[PDB]
Amino acid sequence: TTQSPLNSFYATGTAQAVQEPIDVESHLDNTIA
């Protein structure tokens, strides 16, 4: 004679974010002379 609560069910996922939106690189190779 056991009474159960009937709520022992689960499901699991994951998420992440490990980088910045943009990357910037420079090529200014001229001199104001």
For residue 11, state whether it binds a second copy (rule: CB under 8 A). yes
Distance in angstroms (rounded) separating the CA atoms of residues 20 and 18: 7
Least distance CB 22 / a second copy (angstroms): 8
Scan residues 1-30 and list those touching Ca ion (CB under 5 A): 20, 23
- Closest separation in Å from C-beta 19 to Ca ion: 6
Q: Does 31 bind a second copy (CB under 8 A)?
A: yes
5 belongs to the binding site for a second copy (CB under 8 A): no
d(CA 23, CA 21): 7
